[PDB]
Amino acid sequence: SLVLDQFGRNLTAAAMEGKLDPVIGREKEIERVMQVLSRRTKNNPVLIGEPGVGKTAVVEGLAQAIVHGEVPETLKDKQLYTLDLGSLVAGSRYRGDFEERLKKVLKEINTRGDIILFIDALHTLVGAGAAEGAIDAASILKPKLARGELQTIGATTLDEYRKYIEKDAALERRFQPVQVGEPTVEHTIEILKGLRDRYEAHHRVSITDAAMVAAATLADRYINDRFLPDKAIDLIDEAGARMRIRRAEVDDEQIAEVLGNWTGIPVFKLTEAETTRLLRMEEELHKRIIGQEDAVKAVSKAIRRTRAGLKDPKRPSGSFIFAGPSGVGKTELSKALANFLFGDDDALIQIDMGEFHDRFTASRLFGAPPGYVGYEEGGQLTEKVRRKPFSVVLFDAIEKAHQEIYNSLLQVLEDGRLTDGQGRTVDFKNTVLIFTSNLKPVGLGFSKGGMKQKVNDELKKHFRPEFLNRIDDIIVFHQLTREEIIRMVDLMISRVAGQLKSKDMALVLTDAAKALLAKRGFDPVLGARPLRRTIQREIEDQLSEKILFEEVGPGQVVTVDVDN
Amino acid sequence: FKLTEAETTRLLRMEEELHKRIIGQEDAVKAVSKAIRRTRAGLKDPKRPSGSFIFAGPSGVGKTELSKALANFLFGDDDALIQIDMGEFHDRFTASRLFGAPPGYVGYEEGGQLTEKVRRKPFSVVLFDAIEKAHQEIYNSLLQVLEDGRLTDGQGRTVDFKNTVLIFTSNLGTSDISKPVGLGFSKGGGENDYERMKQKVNDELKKHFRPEFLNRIDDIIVFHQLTREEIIRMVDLMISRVAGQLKSKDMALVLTDAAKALLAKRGFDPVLGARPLRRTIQREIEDQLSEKILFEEVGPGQVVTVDVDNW
Amino acid sequence: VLDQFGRNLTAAAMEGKLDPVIGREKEIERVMQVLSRRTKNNPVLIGEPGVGKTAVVEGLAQAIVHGEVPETLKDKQLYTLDLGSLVAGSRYRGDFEERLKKVLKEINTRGDIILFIDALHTLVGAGAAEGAIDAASILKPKLARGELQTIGATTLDEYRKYIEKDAALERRFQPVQVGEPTVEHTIEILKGLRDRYEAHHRVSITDAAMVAAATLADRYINDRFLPDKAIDLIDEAGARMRIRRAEVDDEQIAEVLGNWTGIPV
Amino acid sequence: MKVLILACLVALALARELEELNVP
Ligand SMILES: Nc1ncnc2c1ncn2[C@@H]1O[C@H](COP(=O)(O)OP(=O)(O)OP(=O)(O)O)[C@@H](O)[C@H]1O
Ligand SMILES: Nc1ncnc2c1ncn2[C@@H]1O[C@H](COP(=O)(O)OP(=O)(O)OP(=O)(O)O)[C@@H](O)[C@H]1O
Ligand SMILES: Nc1ncnc2c1ncn2[C@@H]1O[C@H](COP(=O)(O)OP(=O)(O)OP(=O)(O)O)[C@@H](O)[C@H]1O
Ligand SMILES: Nc1ncnc2c1ncn2[C@@H]1O[C@H](COP(=O)(O)OP(=O)(O)O)[C@@H](O)[C@H]1O
Ligand SMILES: [Mg+2]
Numbered sequence A: 001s002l003v004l005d006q007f008g009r010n011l012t013a014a015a016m017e018g019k020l021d022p023v024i025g026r027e028k029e030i031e032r033v034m035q036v037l038s039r040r041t042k043n044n045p046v047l048i049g050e051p052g053v054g055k056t057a058v059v060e061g062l063a064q065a066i067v068h069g070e071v072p073e074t075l076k077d078k079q080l081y082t083l084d085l086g087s088l089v090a091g092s093r094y095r096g097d098f099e100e101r102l103k104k105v106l107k108e109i110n111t112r113g114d115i116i117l118f119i120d121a122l123h124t125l126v127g128a129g130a131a132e133g134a135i136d137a138a139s140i141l142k143p144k145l146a147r148g149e150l151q152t153i154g155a156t157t158l159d160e161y162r163k164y165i166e167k168d169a170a171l172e173r174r175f176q177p178v179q180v181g182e183p184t185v186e187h188t189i190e191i192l193k194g195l196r197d198r199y200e201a202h203h204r205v206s207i208t209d210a211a212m213v214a215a216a217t218l219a220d221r222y223i224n225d226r227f228l229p230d231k232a233i234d235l236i237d238e239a240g241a242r243m244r245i246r247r248a249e250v251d252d253e254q255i256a257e258v259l260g261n262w263t264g265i266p267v268f269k270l271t272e273a274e275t276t277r278l279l280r281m282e283e284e285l286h287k288r289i290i291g292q293e294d295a296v297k298a299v300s301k302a303i304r305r306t307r308a309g310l311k312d313p314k315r316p317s318g319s320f321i322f323a324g325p326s327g328v329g330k331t332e333l334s335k336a337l338a339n340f341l342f343g344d345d346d347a348l349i350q351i352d353m354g355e356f357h358d359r360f361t362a363s364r365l366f367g368a369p370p371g372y373v374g375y376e377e378g379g380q381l382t383e384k385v386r387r388k389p390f391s392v393v394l395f396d397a398i399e400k401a402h403q404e405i406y407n408s409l410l411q412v413l414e415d416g417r418l419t420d421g422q423g424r425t426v427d428f429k430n431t432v433l434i435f436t437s438n439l440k441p442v443g444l445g446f447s448k449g450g451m452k453q454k455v456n457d458e459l460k461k462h463f464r465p466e467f468l469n470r471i472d473d474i475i476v477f478h479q480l481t482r483e484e485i486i487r488m489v490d491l492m493i494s495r496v497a498g499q500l501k502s503k504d505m506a507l508v509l510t511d512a513a514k515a516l517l518a519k520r521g522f523d524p525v526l527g528a529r530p531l532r533r534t535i536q537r538e539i540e541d542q543l544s545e546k547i548l549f550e551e552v553g554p555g556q557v558v559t560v561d562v563d564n
Numbered sequence B: 001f002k003l004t005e006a007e008t009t010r011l012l013r014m015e016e017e018l019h020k021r022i023i024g025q026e027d028a029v030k031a032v033s034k035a036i037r038r039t040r041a042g043l044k045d046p047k048r049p050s051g052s053f054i055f056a057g058p059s060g061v062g063k064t065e066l067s068k069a070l071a072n073f074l075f076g077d078d079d080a081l082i083q084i085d086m087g088e089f090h091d092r093f094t095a096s097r098l099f100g101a102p103p104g105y106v107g108y109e110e111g112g113q114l115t116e117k118v119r120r121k122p123f124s125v126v127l128f129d130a131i132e133k134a135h136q137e138i139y140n141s142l143l144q145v146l147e148d149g150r151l152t153d154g155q156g157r158t159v160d161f162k163n164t165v166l167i168f169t170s171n172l173g174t175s176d177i178s179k180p181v182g183l184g185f186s187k188g189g190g191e192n193d194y195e196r197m198k199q200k201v202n203d204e205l206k207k208h209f210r211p212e213f214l215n216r217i218d219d220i221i222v223f224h225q226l227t228r229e230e231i232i233r234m235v236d237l238m239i240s241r242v243a244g245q246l247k248s249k250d251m252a253l254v255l256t257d258a259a260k261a262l263l264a265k266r267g268f269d270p271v272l273g274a275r276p277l278r279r280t281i282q283r284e285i286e287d288q289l290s291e292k293i294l295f296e297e298v299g300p301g302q303v304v305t306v307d308v309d310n311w
Numbered sequence C: 001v002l003d004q005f006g007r008n009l010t011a012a013a014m015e016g017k018l019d020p021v022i023g024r025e026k027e028i029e030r031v032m033q034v035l036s037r038r039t040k041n042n043p044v045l046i047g048e049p050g051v052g053k054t055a056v057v058e059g060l061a062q063a064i065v066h067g068e069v070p071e072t073l074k075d076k077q078l079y080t081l082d083l084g085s086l087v088a089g090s091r092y093r094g095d096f097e098e099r100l101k102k103v104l105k106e107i108n109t110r111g112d113i114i115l116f117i118d119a120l121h122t123l124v125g126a127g128a129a130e131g132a133i134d135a136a137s138i139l140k141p142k143l144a145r146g147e148l149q150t151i152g153a154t155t156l157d158e159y160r161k162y163i164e165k166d167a168a169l170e171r172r173f174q175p176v177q178v179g180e181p182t183v184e185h186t187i188e189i190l191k192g193l194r195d196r197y198e199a200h201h202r203v204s205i206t207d208a209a210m211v212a213a214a215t216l217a218d219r220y221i222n223d224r225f226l227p228d229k230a231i232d233l234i235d236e237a238g239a240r241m242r243i244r245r246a247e248v249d250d251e252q253i254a255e256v257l258g259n260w261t262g263i264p265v
Numbered sequence D: 001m002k003v004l005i006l007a008c009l010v011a012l013a014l015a016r017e018l019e020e021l022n023v024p
C-alpha cells in the first residue's frame, strides 16, 4: 500500500470496517484530545492513565468519532494511523535504515496533510532505534513535535510516563498530559452496556442487565491491581466464555463464579451443600475445637456476614483478638477456621509475632522502602495476600511484638488495606484477621470464687486503644473444663491413630484409659498441652518402645488397657 | 475556573453537604469548609497549602471520615483521597517511601508514594493518618511543605502542595482523653470531658511536635466525643450501609424507631460512638440478618423490619 | 600475557630496569615457598600501602634471572597485571570477560606465566556482581588446581573486607604478610637504592641524609608508610637539587619535608 | 546500641548488549 500502512494500522479505516469496539462515555477525554490536536504549536496529547483505564480506547473512540462525523471541522476526515515503533525498527539492520523509514513516515504525513499519528507506548519512543551509534526516534521527532509539523497522540501509562518520559524532560514538554482517569462504576456500566453487542456476537450468549451491574460493582472492590474499565470487561468476557463452553444467558451469578475462581474470593450465591455447611459452621468447627463455644460463634458469624453479602466493603471480614490462657485453642481455632474455608490449615497465613521484637522488623510486614535491600521482595505479609485475598491471617502472639509493630496495622483494620513498600495498597478487606494474644494461678488480693475483665483491661494497658477500637470482637477464652478434656483425649488419640498408625496398626482405647489420660492431663491454668504431654508420656512413648521392640508391631491392633 | 452558579450553591451549602456524612462535629466541618471556600473564592495565600489541618481527638469519631467526606465533596469518591498514612512510617528511612529513593538506589524511577500522587493532581486532599506514629525526621521533611507548598523529592525535583488540603490526623489525645471521666471531682459531661480535656489534647501536640511545625499548620481541631443526640442520627447513617448495596438486591431493610433507639443505647460510649455503634450494628443487626439470609427466612422479595419485642 | 595490560617483570629484571631490593629476602622466600606448591600456589602479599609489596616481586623477578629459583620457578616469566586496566573500557557485555579470557589463554599456550595482580579488592566485583561473571569467578577454577600462579597484593583491610568475607577465596590465595619495615631496615633499603637516585638526579646523596629520612618521616608523617615516605624524601630532594642547579644532605632533604607538612620554618 | 544499620542498596550498575548498525 503506502508507507503509513506498513508501520501502523489505519485506525479510522478499521473504524469504517467496524472492527473497533464502541466507546461509550469518554466524551470529555475525546473532546480534550481534539482541542489539543487543534492547537498551533504543540498539538500532541499524551493520554496518560492507570493501566486499564482505556487510554487506547479513547483514540479508538476518536477514530470512530472521525468517521462518524462527530469530529470538528479542523479535524475533519483526518486518517488516524496508530504507529508500531516495533514495526519501524524491524529489519533496520543498516545505518540510516531506521531513520529513513521514520523520515519516510514523516515525509508522508507532511505530503498528505491529513494524518493524526498515534504513537501508543510513547515511552518506547525514546530509545527506539537506539544502538551503539544512531539517533533514536525521540530525538528525530523533537523539532517536529514542538514546532507543530506533526500531530501525534501519545498514550502511555502513569508509571511509564514517570519512568521514561519525565526522565527525558525535553520530551515531556512536547506533549500535553490528558488525564484519562479510571472511570467510575456508574461509568463502567455504560461501557459494558455499549460492549454488550460485541460479546453477544462473539460468545453467542446474551449477557443480562444485572450481569453488567454486577461485573462493574464486583470488580471495583474485589480487585485492586487492575482498573475498572478492563477488569469489569474481564468478568463479562470470561463469563461469556463460560457459557460458550457449556453449549443461554450470562447471569448475575455467572459473573461472581468467574470472580470467585479468579481472586479466590467466594462472591457467588451459595450451593445447597455450602449453605447447609455454613449454617453447620459452629458444629463443624467444633470437630476440632473442643469447647470455646463463644469463640467459635464469634468467628463463624464473621464468615456468615461475608457470605450473606453483608460484608462491610471498607472493613475486613473479621478482626479478632483471641486473647486467653495459653493452650486452650487460640492457634487451633485459627487453624480450624483455615481448614474450614480452605481444606487445610497450611492456607493459614500465620505471621509469628514473636519474631518481631523491635521496631524495625515491621519491614517484614510490608517490605523494604525504596533504596534498600529487600525492596524487590516487597513484604512477607502483603505478598501473601495479593495471591490469596480471601485468607485467614493469623498474628500469633501479638503481645510479644513491639509497641509499634501493631501500630502499622491501624489502617489494616478500618480501611482494610496496607500500603506496600513498593507502593501497592493490598486488599486486606476479604481477610479474617486474628490476633492471638497470650493472657498461672490466682491474682493479687481477696476475691470471691476461683477473670475475663483482667484480660480485657490488660489489653487496654498493653495495646494502644486506637488498635482495640479497630478490632471487631475481643474474645477472652475459657478455661478448658474437665468435661472438655475428656473430649480432648479423643481428639489427640485420633492424631496418632490413622495418620501415624498407617502401619496396618489400629489404636483402641478403653473408656477407663481415656479417663486416666483426662485425670492426668487436666490442670485449669494450662489446658490441652499438659494433656498432649501426658499422651506422649503414657501412650505414644510406651507405644514407640513396643513398636521398635516389636512387642506389638505392624499388622496388629493395639488396645490400651488402663495401667493403674 | 470561574464558578458555575450550581457549584457556587454547593460551596455555600458545603457544611450541610458534609454533614450528610459527618454527624456532629460542628467546628470541624466548618473550619475545613472554610478552607475550600477561601480557595475557590481566590483568597488563598499563594505560598502555603490550601489547608493544613490537624484532626486531633478521640480515635475514630470522624477524623478519617471527614477527610473522606471532604474527598467526596471535591471529587465524588474516596479513591481521590491521597491517604498516605503515617502509622507505618515508624522508622526514619521509611521517609524514602514518600520521596522515592535518591538516584542510584533501587526504586528511584518509580519511587514516591506521596509526591508522585500529588504531582498528578496538585488539588488533592492528602490524609496523613496517625501522624504521631511516624519518625521525627518525616516531620522535618514535611516542614518544607508547610512553608513553601513545595517539596524536594528523592529524585531532586519539586512538587506542588500549594493546592493540597493537608490533613494531619493525630490520634494523640488518647491517654486520659480516651478515659471518659478525667481525674477528681467535677460536674457532668461538657465540664469533665471538653472543659477538663481539650487543653490536654493541645498539650500533647505541643510536646510531641516541634513548634514551627504547629505554627505553620493553620488549624488544630480537637474533636468531640459524640453525644447521644449525635448517635441517633448516626444509626440512620449506619443502617444505610447495610440497607444499601448489601441489602438493596430485592430486599428492603427498614428499622422501627424502637430499634434505632436500642442501637443508640447499646452503641454509645461517652468517649466514642462511631466504632462501638459499628460493632453493635454488626453484632445485633448484621449477624442476625446474615443467619436469616442464608437460612432464607429473609429472602429476596421481602421487606424485613427490625423491632424490639422486649420493651 | 600481552604487554598491553602489564609488563614482563623478568624481562625488565634481565635488563636491570627494576629497583635493587635490599632487605625483604625472607619475604621473597615465603613467596617462593607459596609459588612452589602444586595446588593453591597463589601468594597474596598482605601489607600496608607502599611497604614494598611490588619491591618483593621486583626482587622476585630478579631472582628468576639471578637463579635463586626452586627449579619449579625456573625460567618463569612474571608478567605484572593491572586488574583494573582490564576493567577500564567495559560498558558493554563481554568487554571485561573477553580481555580476561584472552590473558588466561596466553598463559595456557605460553606456559611459564606468574601473574602479579595488585588490588585484589577489585577482584571481587570486577564485573557486575558475584552472580554475574567477574574476575573472582573466572580465575577461581584455575587457582585451586595450581594451573594459574597469581601473586596478590591487598592491604589488610581489603583482605578482610573482600577476601575474608568471600567464601571460597580465602582458600585459593595463601597469605604472605609483608610487614612494615623498621628504621634500620629502611636505611638499608635506601643504601641499595642510592645507585639509582645518584645516577638519575646526577647528585650525591650523603649517608647523613638517609639516617634522617628514616627518622623524620616516622616522626612527622602519619598518613602513609615508611619504605615509601623515606624513599620519597631523597627522591624529591634530588629533584629539587636538579631544579635549583650538587649534594644532598640532611639539610637538602630537610626543606623537602617542610614543603608538605604545615611547618612555616 | 539499637542504632540501625540502613543497608542502602544501590541500583544495579550492569552491562549493556548492543544492536549494531550493519555496514559492508
Ligand atoms: N470508554 C470506553 N468505552 C469502551 N470500551 C472501553 C472504554 N475504555 C476502555 N475500554 C475497553 O477497555 C479495555 C482496555 O484496553 P485499552 O487498551 O483501551 O486500555 P489502556 O488504558 O490503553 O491500557 P494499557 O495502558 O494497558 O494499554 C479495552 O477492551 C477497551 O476497548
Ligand atoms: N480448643 C482446643 N481444641 C483442641 N485441641 C486443643 C485445644 N486447645 C488446646 N488444644 C491442644 O493443645 C494445643 C495447644 O493449642 P493452641 O496451639 O491453640 O495453643 P494456644 O491457645 O495458642 O496457646 P499459646 O498461649 O501457647 O499460644 C493444640 O494444638 C491441641 O493439640
Ligand atoms: N461522623 C462520624 N463520626 C464518627 N464515626 C463515623 C462517622 N461517620 C462514619 N463513622 C464511622 O466511624 C469509622 C471510623 O472512622 P472515623 O473517621 O470516625 O475514625 P477516626 O475518628 O479517625 O478514629 P481513629 O483515631 O481510630 O483513626 C468509619 O469507618 C465509619 O464507619
Ligand atoms: N627492599 C625494598 N623494600 C621495599 N620497597 C623497596 C625496596 N627496594 C626498593 N623499594 C621501593 O619500593 C617502591 C615500590 O613500591 P612498593 O613499595 O612495592 O609499593 P606497595 O608496598 O604499596 O606495593 C619503589 O619506590 C622502590 O624503589
Ligand atoms: Mg498459641
Ligand SMILES: [Mg+2]
Pocket: B060, B063, B064, B129, B169
Ligand atoms: Mg482514623
